Design an enzyme around this catalytic site. Structure first.
Site, PDB file in Angstrom:
ATOM      1  N   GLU A 192       0.825  -1.202   0.000  1.00  0.00           N
ATOM      2  CA  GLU A 192       0.000   0.000   0.000  1.00  0.00           C
ATOM      3  C   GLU A 192       0.863   1.257   0.000  1.00  0.00           C
ATOM      4  OE1 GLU A 192      -2.995  -0.083   3.011  1.00  0.00           O
ATOM      5  OE2 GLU A 192      -4.167   1.541   2.108  1.00  0.00           O
ATOM      6  N   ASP A 211      -7.581   3.421  -1.628  1.00  0.00           N
ATOM      7  CA  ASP A 211      -6.432   3.703  -0.777  1.00  0.00           C
ATOM      8  C   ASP A 211      -5.805   5.043  -1.142  1.00  0.00           C
ATOM      9  OD1 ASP A 211      -6.721   1.157   0.498  1.00  0.00           O
ATOM     10  OD2 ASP A 211      -5.710   0.235  -1.211  1.00  0.00           O
ATOM     11  N   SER A 260      -6.967   1.580  -5.873  1.00  0.00           N
ATOM     12  CA  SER A 260      -7.109   0.594  -4.811  1.00  0.00           C
ATOM     13  C   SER A 260      -5.916  -0.354  -4.811  1.00  0.00           C
ATOM     14  CB  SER A 260      -8.404  -0.194  -4.968  1.00  0.00           C
ATOM     15  OG  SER A 260      -8.544  -1.123  -3.908  1.00  0.00           O
ATOM     16  N   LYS A 276      -4.362  -3.569  -3.751  1.00  0.00           N
ATOM     17  CA  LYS A 276      -4.626  -4.915  -3.261  1.00  0.00           C
ATOM     18  C   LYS A 276      -3.371  -5.770  -3.382  1.00  0.00           C
ATOM     19  CE  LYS A 276      -7.605  -8.974  -3.952  1.00  0.00           C
ATOM     20  NZ  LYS A 276      -7.946  -9.138  -2.512  1.00  0.00           N
TER      21      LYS A 276
END
Ligand SMILES: [Cl-]
Ligand SMILES: [Cl-]
Lengths: 124, 174
Positions: free
Chosen positions: A4, A25, A36, A38
């Site tokens: 992240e 995010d 995002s 992941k």
């Protein structure tokens, strides 16, 4: 560094959304591109060994990114009118089997017709 | 595409109505330099509306930092600490704490339990008051229509008309 956080290195400053902001995010505060982040590690990739299990996990994320209307939490408000593009940045490990890559590429194409760009990165 | 706007946010449970200044560009968030107006749930539409307008007047049209790789609005200002994810969460925690202490909740779950949320945005075109669906205790979201249930008011709306529109949106929350 965590996936992240690594995703944030390639993005403009101030993009990071507060934790657990639905599936998003990062948010480009100027252009409206949402990201995002992941990640699938070796253990989780090994755990989702049954067919469609990998596809499900990703599809589960894709649907949330795509069906996003509005989220307001931690003192921050974002809605779909602000969003100009949607992307899932997916990390996959080395022990990803051919059968699993089939699910990954399937979710990539699913997301694309769902209006979501699924970008896959192989992590050593 | 993006024009200058002003934002605010309304939180309401049984015990109070809370109007805060939000600031931003595309996204909008709790502004530590903005103002807060607390009131009892029976505030007049005039006062409540002046609360909303005063909060809006303190809203900032701001980005995290200068961008050169794209087009950016010539009117926009910059504030890195506003957009910082750690500062964001921390000032939220202080926002939450001040309300629990003020109203003697002694628990976060009773604070948010009966709390609805309305989004306010304003530009040259209209004043938009948007209801939400209280998804989780600390998470609000789409009601979710497309998005036909928003209270859209004229920019020349009186304070009374604005306060009145806000209550209309508060009754549309799910
Ligand atoms: Cl926007
Ligand atoms: Cl498919």
């Amino acid at each position: 560094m965590p996936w992240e956080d690594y995703v944030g290195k390639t993005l403009p400053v101030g993009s990071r959304l507060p934790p657990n902001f639905k599936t998003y995010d990062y948010f480009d505060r100027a252009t409206g591109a949402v990201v995002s982040a992941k990640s699938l590690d070796t253990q989780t990739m090994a755990k989702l060994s049954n067919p469609n299990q990998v596809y499900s996990s990703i599809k589960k994320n894709i649907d949330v990114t795509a069906k996003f209307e509005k989220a307001s939490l931690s003192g921050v408000t974002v809605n779909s009118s602000m969003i100009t593009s949607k992307e899932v940045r997916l990390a996959v490990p080395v022990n990803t089997t051919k059968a699993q890559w089939t699910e990954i590429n399937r979710a990539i194409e699913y997301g694309k017709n769902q209006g979501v760009k699924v970008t896959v990165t192989q992590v050593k | 595409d993006i024009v200058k706007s002003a934002w605010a946010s309304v939180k309401m449970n049984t015990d109070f109505i809370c109007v805060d200044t939000y600031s931003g560009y595309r996204s909008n968030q709790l502004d530590p330099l903005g103002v807060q107006h607390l009131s009892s749930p029976d505030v007049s539409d005039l006062d409540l509306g002046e609360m909303v307008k005063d909060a809006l007047s303190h809203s900032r049209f701001v980005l995290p930092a200068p961008r050169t790789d794209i087009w950016i609005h010539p009117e926009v200002t910059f504030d890195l600490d506003l957009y910082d994810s750690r500062r964001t969460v921390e000032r939220y925690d202080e926002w939450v704490k001040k309300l629990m202490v003020h109203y003697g909740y002694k628990t976060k779950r009773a604070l948010f339990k009966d709390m609805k949320s309305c989004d306010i945005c304003c530009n040259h075109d209209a004043i938009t008051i948007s209801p939400t669906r209280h998804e989780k205790l600390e998470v609000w979201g789409g009601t979710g229509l497309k998005g036909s249930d928003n209270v859209i008011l004229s920019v020349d709306s009186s304070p009374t008309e604005i306060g009145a529109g806000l209550r209309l949106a508060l009754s549309r929350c799910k």
